[PDB]
Amino acid sequence: RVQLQQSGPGLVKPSQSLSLTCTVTGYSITSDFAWNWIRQFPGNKLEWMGYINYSGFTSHNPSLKSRISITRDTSKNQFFLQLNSVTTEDTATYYCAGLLWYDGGAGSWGQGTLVTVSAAKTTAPSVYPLAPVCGDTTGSSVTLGCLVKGYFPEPVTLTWNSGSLSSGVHTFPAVLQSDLYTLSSSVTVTSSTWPSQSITCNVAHPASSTKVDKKIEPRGPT
Amino acid sequence: DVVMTQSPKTISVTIGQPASISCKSSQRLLNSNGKTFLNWLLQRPGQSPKRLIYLGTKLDSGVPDRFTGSGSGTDFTLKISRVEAEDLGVYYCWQGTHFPYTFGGGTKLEIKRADAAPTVSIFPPSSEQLTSGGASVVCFLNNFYPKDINVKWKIDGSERQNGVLNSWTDQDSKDSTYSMSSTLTLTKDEYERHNSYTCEATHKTSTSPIVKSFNRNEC
C-alpha cells in the first residue's frame, strides 16, 4: 500500500527551525490524499499541524500561527514541514500521515521522528555490559543486561545478537538527567545455553554516528 | 475549536471480554454532504497511531472486524467484540469536520490478567564503568502483574534512596505483564567503600519482598 517515512534532523537549537521530510512510496502525492503533519507531545497529547493535499492546497493549525510552512516536491514524491522560532515546547514526535481527501480513510502514518529542541550538546553513549552475579546463574533461566549511559539526544537503537535474539527482551524507556540520557535493556535466556551461546548488545546512536557491540562476558574466568 | 472528550480515561479488560469506549465532541460532526468525519485510532506501545474506524461507522482498510464504531451528531462509541492482548494501547478519536481538526485525549486499554510476581535480577557495576569513576548498580523487576510495585535499595543493610532512577515498560502484549528497571548510581569511590548491595521489590503477589543482593569483589 502507501508507505510514509519521516526524515530530518532530530536536534534543533532554540529559536531556529525544525525541517522534516516525508517520503511517500506506493502512491503518487498528486493523487487523492491530504498529506498531514501531526505531532505527539511527551504528555501524549496529539496535535494536528496541517496538510498539503494532492493538488498543492494547504491548511494549518492556527495554534502555530505563521511559524509553519508545508511544501511538496512532486518530482521527488515528497512533502515537507518547516517550523520556525522553535522552543522546548516544540519538543515532540513528529508524524507525517496521509488521509484520503474524500472520506478521511486509509490513514497511513510514517514511523514518527523525535525532534528535540535544545541547546544541549550531542554526546555519544558508553555501553556497559551487565553480567549476572554467579549465584544467579544456577537456575533454569538467566538474565543478562546492557546499560546505555550518558547520551544526548534521543534516540538510540538497541538489539541483541544483531536482532536474532528478540524473545525475552525488555528495553526500558530512557531517563533524562542533566541533559544526558540513560537506558538499560534486559535479555533472559535458558541458563544451559549461556555462556556457550554468546550474547551481544548492539547499540547505535545515529546523532553521534556511533555504534558499540558489547559482548556480555561472565563474571569469573572468561 | 471542537473539543473531543473520551471516556473512560483508562479501561481494564479480561481477554475474551468486550470493551466499549466513548468520544463526545463539542460540535456535531455531520457535514453538508452527509458524511461524518469521525475516525478512531489505536496506538500500540512504541508505534504510531494506526487506523481503525472512519466515517463514524465504517471499518477502515484492513482492520479486524472485531472493531465497531457507532453513534452520530456528537456522541460516538467504539466497541471491541472480544479483546485480545494485542489490542492494548491507547485509543484515540479524531474529527475532520471542523477546522482545525482535533483529537480526543485518548483512552488506555489495559489487559486484566492473573497476578504475577516479578523476576528480580541485580547487577554490579561493570569493570569498564568502574575505570570511568562512576558506578551504576542495576536491578530489573521483570514480568509482574499488577503494575504497582515497590523497589528499595540497601547498601550494607541500610536503605539508600539518593541517586536512584527508575523506568517502567508499557504492558507487554505477549503476556500482559509489566517490567521495571531501577538504577542506583554512585561515584566509584563510594561503591568501592561498601560491600553489600541489595535490591528489594515489594509486590502484592508476596507478603515478603523479593530480595536480590551481591557482595563487591565476589563473583
Coordinates of all heavy atoms in Angstrom, one line a residue, chain B residues 48-127:
Chain B
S48 N 3.3 4.1 16.0 CA 2.5 5.3 15.6 C 1.0 4.9 15.6 O 0.6 3.7 15.6 CB 2.9 5.8 14.2 OG 2.8 4.7 13.3
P49 N 0.1 5.9 15.8 CA -1.3 5.6 15.7 C -1.6 4.9 14.4 O -0.9 5.2 13.4 CB -2.0 6.9 15.9 CG -1.0 7.8 16.5 CD 0.4 7.3 16.0
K50 N -2.6 4.0 14.3 CA -3.0 3.3 13.1 C -4.5 3.3 13.0 O -5.2 3.3 14.0 CB -2.5 1.9 13.1 CG -1.0 1.7 13.5 CD -0.3 0.8 12.7 CE 1.2 0.8 13.1 NZ 1.7 -0.7 13.2
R51 N -5.0 3.3 11.8 CA -6.5 3.4 11.5 C -7.3 2.3 12.1 O -6.9 1.1 12.2 CB -6.7 3.5 10.0 CG -6.1 2.4 9.2 CD -6.5 2.6 7.7 NE -6.0 1.4 7.0 CZ -4.8 1.3 6.4 NH1 -3.9 2.3 6.6 NH2 -4.4 0.2 5.8
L52 N -8.5 2.6 12.5 CA -9.5 1.6 12.9 C -10.8 1.8 12.2 O -11.3 0.9 11.5 CB -9.7 1.6 14.4 CG -8.6 1.0 15.3 CD1 -8.9 1.2 16.8 CD2 -8.3 -0.4 14.9
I53 N -11.4 3.0 12.5 CA -12.7 3.4 12.0 C -12.7 4.7 11.4 O -11.9 5.6 11.8 CB -13.8 3.4 13.2 CG1 -13.9 2.1 14.0 CG2 -15.1 3.9 12.7 CD1 -14.6 1.0 13.2
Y54 N -13.5 4.9 10.4 CA -13.6 6.2 9.7 C -15.1 6.4 9.3 O -15.8 5.4 9.3 CB -12.7 6.4 8.5 CG -12.9 5.5 7.3 CD1 -13.3 6.2 6.1 CD2 -12.8 4.2 7.3 CE1 -13.6 5.4 5.0 CE2 -13.1 3.4 6.2 CZ -13.5 4.1 5.0 OH -13.8 3.3 3.9
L55 N -15.4 7.6 8.9 CA -16.8 8.0 8.5 C -17.8 7.6 9.6 O -19.0 7.3 9.3 CB -17.1 7.3 7.2 CG -16.4 8.0 6.0 CD1 -16.9 7.3 4.7 CD2 -16.7 9.5 6.0
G56 N -17.3 7.7 10.9 CA -18.1 7.3 12.0 C -18.4 5.9 12.3 O -18.3 5.4 13.4
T57 N -18.7 5.1 11.2 CA -19.3 3.8 11.5 C -18.7 2.7 10.5 O -19.0 1.6 10.5 CB -20.8 3.8 11.2 OG1 -21.1 4.6 10.0 CG2 -21.5 4.5 12.4
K58 N -17.7 3.2 9.7 CA -17.1 2.3 8.7 C -15.8 1.7 9.2 O -14.9 2.4 9.8 CB -16.9 3.1 7.4 CG -16.8 2.2 6.2 CD -17.1 3.0 4.9 CE -16.4 2.3 3.8 NZ -16.6 3.1 2.5
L59 N -15.6 0.5 8.9 CA -14.3 -0.2 9.2 C -13.2 0.3 8.3 O -13.3 0.1 7.1 CB -14.5 -1.7 9.2 CG -13.5 -2.6 9.8 CD1 -13.3 -2.4 11.3 CD2 -13.8 -4.1 9.5
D60 N -12.1 0.9 8.8 CA -11.0 1.3 7.9 C -10.3 0.1 7.2 O -10.5 -1.0 7.6 CB -10.0 2.2 8.6 CG -9.6 3.4 7.7 OD1 -9.5 3.3 6.5 OD2 -9.5 4.6 8.3
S61 N -9.5 0.4 6.2 CA -8.9 -0.6 5.3 C -8.0 -1.6 6.1 O -7.1 -1.2 6.8 CB -8.0 0.2 4.3 OG -7.4 -0.7 3.4
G62 N -8.4 -2.8 6.0 CA -7.7 -3.9 6.6 C -7.8 -4.1 8.1 O -7.1 -4.8 8.7
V63 N -8.8 -3.4 8.7 CA -8.9 -3.5 10.2 C -9.7 -4.8 10.6 O -10.7 -5.1 9.9 CB -9.6 -2.3 10.8 CG1 -9.7 -2.4 12.3 CG2 -8.9 -1.0 10.3
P64 N -9.3 -5.5 11.6 CA -10.1 -6.6 12.0 C -11.6 -6.2 12.3 O -11.9 -5.1 12.8 CB -9.5 -7.0 13.4 CG -8.0 -6.6 13.2 CD -8.0 -5.4 12.4
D65 N -12.5 -7.1 11.9 CA -13.9 -6.8 12.0 C -14.4 -6.8 13.5 O -15.6 -6.6 13.8 CB -14.8 -7.7 11.2 CG -14.9 -9.1 11.7 OD1 -13.9 -9.6 12.3 OD2 -15.9 -9.8 11.4
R66 N -13.5 -7.1 14.4 CA -13.8 -7.1 15.8 C -14.1 -5.6 16.3 O -14.7 -5.4 17.4 CB -12.7 -7.7 16.7 CG -12.7 -9.2 16.6 CD -11.6 -9.8 17.5 NE -10.3 -9.1 17.2 CZ -9.6 -8.3 18.0 NH1 -10.1 -8.0 19.2 NH2 -8.5 -7.8 17.5
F67 N -13.6 -4.6 15.5 CA -13.9 -3.3 15.9 C -15.2 -2.7 15.3 O -15.4 -2.9 14.0 CB -12.7 -2.4 15.5 CG -11.4 -2.8 16.2 CD1 -10.6 -3.8 15.7 CD2 -11.1 -2.3 17.5 CE1 -9.4 -4.1 16.3 CE2 -10.0 -2.7 18.1 CZ -9.1 -3.6 17.5
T68 N -16.0 -2.1 16.0 CA -17.2 -1.5 15.6 C -17.4 -0.1 16.1 O -17.3 0.2 17.3 CB -18.5 -2.3 16.0 OG1 -18.6 -3.4 15.1 CG2 -19.7 -1.5 15.8
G69 N -17.7 0.9 15.2 CA -18.0 2.2 15.5 C -19.4 2.6 15.3 O -20.0 2.2 14.3
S70 N -20.0 3.3 16.3 CA -21.4 3.7 16.3 C -21.6 5.1 16.8 O -20.6 5.7 17.3 CB -22.2 2.7 17.2 OG -21.9 2.9 18.6
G71 N -22.8 5.6 16.7 CA -23.1 7.0 17.1 C -23.3 8.0 15.9 O -23.3 7.6 14.8
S72 N -23.6 9.2 16.3 CA -23.8 10.2 15.3 C -23.9 11.6 16.0 O -23.9 11.6 17.2 CB -25.0 10.0 14.4 OG -26.2 9.7 15.1
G73 N -24.1 12.7 15.2 CA -24.1 14.0 15.8 C -22.9 14.3 16.6 O -21.9 14.8 16.0
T74 N -23.0 14.2 17.9 CA -21.8 14.4 18.8 C -21.4 13.2 19.6 O -20.3 13.2 20.1 CB -22.1 15.6 19.8 OG1 -23.2 15.2 20.7 CG2 -22.6 16.8 19.0
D75 N -22.2 12.1 19.7 CA -21.8 11.1 20.6 C -21.4 9.8 19.8 O -22.2 9.3 19.1 CB -23.0 10.8 21.5 CG -23.2 11.8 22.6 OD1 -22.6 12.9 22.5 OD2 -23.9 11.5 23.6
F76 N -20.2 9.3 20.1 CA -19.6 8.2 19.3 C -19.1 7.1 20.2 O -18.6 7.3 21.4 CB -18.6 8.7 18.4 CG -19.1 9.8 17.5 CD1 -19.1 11.1 17.8 CD2 -19.7 9.5 16.2 CE1 -19.6 12.1 17.0 CE2 -20.2 10.4 15.4 CZ -20.1 11.7 15.8
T77 N -19.2 5.9 19.8 CA -18.8 4.7 20.6 C -17.9 3.8 19.7 O -18.3 3.5 18.6 CB -19.9 3.9 21.2 OG1 -20.7 4.8 22.1 CG2 -19.4 2.8 22.0
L78 N -16.8 3.3 20.3 CA -16.0 2.3 19.7 C -16.2 1.0 20.5 O -16.0 1.0 21.7 CB -14.6 2.6 19.6 CG -13.7 1.5 19.2 CD1 -13.8 1.3 17.6 CD2 -12.2 1.6 19.5
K79 N -16.5 -0.2 19.8 CA -16.6 -1.4 20.6 C -15.7 -2.4 20.1 O -15.5 -2.5 18.9 CB -18.1 -1.9 20.7 CG -19.1 -0.7 21.0 CD -20.4 -1.2 21.4 CE -20.9 -0.5 22.7 NZ -21.8 0.6 22.4
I80 N -15.1 -3.2 21.0 CA -14.4 -4.4 20.6 C -15.2 -5.6 21.1 O -15.5 -5.7 22.3 CB -12.9 -4.3 21.2 CG1 -12.3 -3.0 21.1 CG2 -12.0 -5.4 20.6 CD1 -11.1 -2.8 22.1
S81 N -15.5 -6.4 20.2 CA -16.5 -7.5 20.5 C -15.8 -8.4 21.5 O -16.5 -8.7 22.6 CB -16.8 -8.4 19.3 OG -15.7 -8.7 18.5
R82 N -14.6 -8.8 21.3 CA -13.8 -9.6 22.1 C -12.3 -9.1 22.1 O -11.7 -9.1 21.0 CB -13.8 -11.1 21.7 CG -14.9 -11.4 20.6 CD -15.0 -12.9 20.4 NE -13.9 -13.5 19.7 CZ -13.6 -13.2 18.5 NH1 -14.3 -12.3 17.8 NH2 -12.5 -13.8 17.9
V83 N -11.8 -8.7 23.3 CA -10.5 -8.2 23.4 C -9.4 -9.2 23.4 O -9.5 -10.3 24.0 CB -10.4 -7.4 24.7 CG1 -8.9 -7.0 25.0 CG2 -11.2 -6.1 24.7
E84 N -8.4 -9.0 22.6 CA -7.2 -9.8 22.6 C -6.0 -9.0 23.2 O -6.0 -7.8 23.1 CB -6.9 -10.3 21.2 CG -8.1 -10.9 20.5 CD -7.8 -11.2 19.0 OE1 -6.8 -10.7 18.5 OE2 -8.6 -11.9 18.4
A85 N -5.0 -9.7 23.7 CA -3.9 -8.9 24.3 C -3.2 -7.9 23.4 O -2.8 -6.8 23.8 CB -2.8 -9.9 24.8
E86 N -3.2 -8.2 22.1 CA -2.6 -7.3 21.2 C -3.4 -6.0 21.0 O -3.0 -5.1 20.3 CB -2.4 -7.8 19.8 CG -1.3 -8.9 19.7 CD -1.2 -9.4 18.2 OE1 -0.3 -8.8 17.5 OE2 -1.9 -10.4 17.9
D87 N -4.6 -5.9 21.6 CA -5.4 -4.7 21.5 C -5.1 -3.7 22.5 O -5.7 -2.6 22.5 CB -6.9 -5.0 21.7 CG -7.5 -6.0 20.7 OD1 -7.0 -6.0 19.5 OD2 -8.5 -6.7 21.1
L88 N -4.1 -4.0 23.4 CA -3.7 -3.0 24.4 C -3.1 -1.8 23.8 O -2.4 -1.9 22.7 CB -2.8 -3.6 25.5 CG -1.4 -4.0 25.0 CD1 -0.3 -2.9 25.2 CD2 -1.0 -5.2 25.9
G89 N -3.2 -0.6 24.5 CA -2.6 0.6 24.0 C -3.5 1.7 24.2 O -4.3 1.6 25.1
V90 N -3.3 2.8 23.4 CA -4.1 4.0 23.6 C -5.0 4.2 22.4 O -4.6 4.3 21.3 CB -3.3 5.2 23.9 CG1 -4.2 6.5 24.0 CG2 -2.4 5.0 25.1
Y91 N -6.3 4.3 22.7 CA -7.3 4.6 21.6 C -7.7 6.1 21.6 O -8.0 6.7 22.6 CB -8.5 3.7 21.8 CG -8.3 2.2 21.6 CD1 -7.7 1.5 22.6 CD2 -8.6 1.6 20.5 CE1 -7.4 0.1 22.5 CE2 -8.4 0.3 20.3 CZ -7.8 -0.5 21.3 OH -7.6 -1.8 21.0
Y92 N -7.7 6.6 20.4 CA -8.0 8.0 20.1 C -9.1 8.1 19.2 O -9.3 7.4 18.2 CB -6.8 8.7 19.6 CG -5.5 8.8 20.4 CD1 -4.5 8.0 20.2 CD2 -5.4 9.8 21.4 CE1 -3.3 8.1 21.0 CE2 -4.3 10.0 22.1 CZ -3.2 9.1 21.9 OH -2.1 9.2 22.7
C93 N -9.9 9.2 19.4 CA -10.9 9.6 18.4 C -10.3 10.8 17.7 O -9.5 11.5 18.2 CB -12.3 9.8 18.9 SG -12.4 10.9 20.3
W94 N -10.8 11.1 16.5 CA -10.4 12.3 15.7 C -11.5 12.9 14.9 O -12.3 12.0 14.4 CB -9.2 11.9 14.8 CG -8.8 12.9 13.8 CD1 -7.8 13.9 14.0 CD2 -9.2 13.0 12.5 NE1 -7.7 14.6 12.9 CE2 -8.5 14.1 11.9 CE3 -10.1 12.4 11.6 CZ2 -8.7 14.6 10.6 CZ3 -10.3 12.8 10.3 CH2 -9.6 13.9 9.8
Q95 N -11.6 14.2 14.8 CA -12.6 14.8 13.9 C -11.9 15.6 12.8 O -11.0 16.4 13.0 CB -13.6 15.7 14.7 CG -13.1 16.9 15.4 CD -13.1 18.1 14.5 OE1 -13.9 18.1 13.5 NE2 -12.4 19.2 14.8
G96 N -12.4 15.4 11.6 CA -12.1 16.1 10.4 C -13.1 17.0 9.9 O -13.0 17.5 8.8
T97 N -14.2 17.3 10.7 CA -15.3 18.1 10.1 C -15.1 19.6 10.4 O -15.6 20.4 9.6 CB -16.7 17.7 10.7 OG1 -16.8 16.3 10.5 CG2 -17.8 18.5 10.1
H98 N -14.5 20.0 11.5 CA -14.4 21.4 11.8 C -12.9 21.8 12.0 O -12.3 21.3 12.8 CB -15.1 21.8 13.1 CG -16.6 21.6 13.1 ND1 -17.4 22.5 12.5 CD2 -17.4 20.6 13.6 CE1 -18.7 22.1 12.6 NE2 -18.7 20.9 13.3
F99 N -12.5 22.8 11.1 CA -11.2 23.3 11.3 C -11.0 24.1 12.6 O -11.9 24.9 12.9 CB -10.8 24.1 10.1 CG -9.6 25.0 10.1 CD1 -8.3 24.6 9.7 CD2 -9.7 26.3 10.7 CE1 -7.2 25.4 9.8 CE2 -8.6 27.1 10.7 CZ -7.4 26.7 10.3
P100 N -9.9 24.0 13.3 CA -8.8 22.9 12.9 C -9.2 21.6 13.5 O -9.8 21.4 14.5 CB -7.6 23.5 13.6 CG -8.2 24.1 14.9 CD -9.4 24.8 14.4
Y101 N -8.7 20.5 12.9 CA -9.0 19.1 13.2 C -8.4 18.8 14.6 O -7.3 19.3 14.9 CB -8.5 18.2 12.1 CG -9.0 18.8 10.8 CD1 -8.1 18.9 9.8 CD2 -10.3 19.2 10.6 CE1 -8.5 19.5 8.6 CE2 -10.7 19.8 9.4 CZ -9.8 20.0 8.4 OH -10.2 20.5 7.2
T102 N -9.0 18.0 15.4 CA -8.7 17.8 16.8 C -8.8 16.3 17.2 O -9.6 15.6 16.6 CB -9.5 18.6 17.7 OG1 -10.9 18.5 17.3 CG2 -9.2 20.1 17.7
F103 N -8.0 15.9 18.1 CA -8.0 14.5 18.7 C -8.6 14.5 20.1 O -8.4 15.4 20.9 CB -6.6 14.0 18.8 CG -5.9 13.8 17.5 CD1 -5.2 14.9 16.9 CD2 -5.9 12.6 16.9 CE1 -4.5 14.7 15.7 CE2 -5.3 12.4 15.7 CZ -4.6 13.4 15.1
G104 N -9.3 13.4 20.4 CA -9.6 13.1 21.8 C -8.3 12.9 22.6 O -7.2 12.8 22.0
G105 N -8.4 13.0 23.9 CA -7.3 12.9 24.8 C -6.8 11.5 25.0 O -5.8 11.2 25.6
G106 N -7.5 10.5 24.4 CA -7.1 9.1 24.4 C -7.6 8.3 25.6 O -7.8 8.9 26.6
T107 N -7.9 7.0 25.3 CA -8.3 6.1 26.3 C -7.4 4.9 26.4 O -7.2 4.2 25.3 CB -9.7 5.5 26.1 OG1 -10.7 6.5 26.2 CG2 -10.1 4.4 27.1
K108 N -6.8 4.6 27.6 CA -5.8 3.5 27.6 C -6.5 2.2 27.9 O -7.1 2.1 29.0 CB -4.7 3.7 28.5 CG -3.7 2.5 28.5 CD -2.5 2.7 29.3 CE -1.7 1.4 29.4 NZ -0.6 1.5 30.4
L109 N -6.4 1.2 27.1 CA -6.9 -0.2 27.2 C -5.7 -1.0 27.8 O -4.7 -1.2 27.2 CB -7.3 -0.8 25.9 CG -7.8 -2.3 26.0 CD1 -8.9 -2.4 27.1 CD2 -8.4 -2.8 24.7
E110 N -6.0 -1.5 29.0 CA -5.1 -2.4 29.7 C -5.8 -3.8 29.8 O -7.0 -3.9 29.8 CB -4.8 -1.8 31.1 CG -4.8 -0.3 31.1 CD -4.3 0.3 32.4 OE1 -5.0 0.3 33.4 OE2 -3.1 0.8 32.4
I111 N -4.9 -4.8 29.8 CA -5.3 -6.2 29.9 C -5.3 -6.7 31.3 O -4.3 -6.5 32.0 CB -4.5 -7.1 29.0 CG1 -4.5 -6.7 27.5 CG2 -5.0 -8.6 29.0 CD1 -5.9 -6.8 26.8
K112 N -6.4 -7.2 31.8 CA -6.5 -7.8 33.1 C -6.1 -9.2 33.0 O -6.4 -10.0 32.1 CB -7.9 -7.7 33.7 CG -8.0 -7.2 35.1 CD -9.5 -7.2 35.6 CE -10.5 -7.3 34.5 NZ -11.8 -6.9 35.0
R113 N -5.3 -9.6 34.0 CA -4.7 -11.0 34.0 C -4.3 -11.4 35.4 O -4.5 -10.6 36.3 CB -3.4 -11.0 33.1 CG -2.3 -10.2 33.7 CD -0.9 -10.8 33.3 NE -0.6 -11.9 34.3 CZ 0.1 -12.9 34.0 NH1 0.6 -13.0 32.8 NH2 0.4 -13.8 34.9
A114 N -3.9 -12.7 35.4 CA -3.5 -13.3 36.7 C -2.3 -12.6 37.3 O -1.4 -12.2 36.6 CB -3.3 -14.8 36.5
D115 N -2.4 -12.4 38.6 CA -1.2 -11.8 39.3 C 0.1 -12.6 38.9 O 0.0 -13.8 38.6 CB -1.4 -11.7 40.8 CG -2.3 -10.6 41.2 OD1 -2.9 -10.0 40.2 OD2 -2.5 -10.4 42.4
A116 N 1.2 -11.9 39.0 CA 2.5 -12.5 38.7 C 3.6 -11.7 39.5 O 3.7 -10.5 39.4 CB 2.8 -12.5 37.2
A117 N 4.3 -12.4 40.2 CA 5.5 -11.9 40.9 C 6.6 -11.6 40.0 O 6.8 -12.2 38.9 CB 6.0 -12.8 42.0
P118 N 7.4 -10.5 40.3 CA 8.5 -10.2 39.4 C 9.6 -11.2 39.5 O 9.8 -11.8 40.5 CB 9.0 -8.8 40.0 CG 8.4 -8.8 41.4 CD 7.2 -9.6 41.4
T119 N 10.4 -11.2 38.4 CA 11.7 -11.9 38.4 C 12.7 -10.8 38.7 O 12.9 -9.9 37.8 CB 12.0 -12.6 37.1 OG1 11.0 -13.6 36.9 CG2 13.3 -13.3 37.1
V120 N 13.4 -10.9 39.8 CA 14.3 -9.9 40.2 C 15.8 -10.3 39.9 O 16.2 -11.4 40.3 CB 14.2 -9.5 41.7 CG1 15.2 -8.4 42.0 CG2 12.8 -9.1 42.0
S121 N 16.5 -9.4 39.3 CA 17.9 -9.6 38.9 C 18.7 -8.4 39.2 O 18.4 -7.3 38.8 CB 18.0 -9.9 37.4 OG 17.2 -11.0 36.9
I122 N 19.8 -8.6 39.9 CA 20.7 -7.4 40.3 C 22.1 -7.5 39.6 O 22.6 -8.6 39.5 CB 20.8 -7.3 41.8 CG1 21.4 -5.9 42.2 CG2 21.7 -8.5 42.3 CD1 21.4 -5.7 43.7
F123 N 22.6 -6.4 39.2 CA 23.9 -6.3 38.5 C 24.9 -5.3 39.1 O 24.6 -4.1 39.1 CB 23.7 -6.0 37.0 CG 22.7 -7.0 36.4 CD1 21.4 -6.9 36.5 CD2 23.2 -8.1 35.7 CE1 20.5 -7.8 35.9 CE2 22.4 -9.0 35.1 CZ 21.0 -8.9 35.2
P124 N 26.0 -5.8 39.5 CA 27.1 -4.9 39.9 C 27.5 -4.0 38.8 O 27.2 -4.2 37.6 CB 28.2 -5.9 40.2 CG 27.5 -7.1 40.5 CD 26.4 -7.2 39.5
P125 N 28.3 -2.9 39.1 CA 28.8 -2.1 38.1 C 29.8 -2.9 37.2 O 30.5 -3.8 37.7 CB 29.6 -1.0 38.9 CG 29.1 -1.1 40.3 CD 28.6 -2.5 40.5
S126 N 29.9 -2.5 35.9 CA 30.9 -3.2 35.1 C 32.3 -2.7 35.3 O 32.6 -1.6 35.8 CB 30.5 -2.9 33.6 OG 30.6 -1.5 33.3
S127 N 33.3 -3.5 35.0 CA 34.7 -3.1 35.1 C 35.0 -1.9 34.3 O 35.8 -1.0 34.6 CB 35.6 -4.3 34.7 OG 35.2 -5.4 35.4

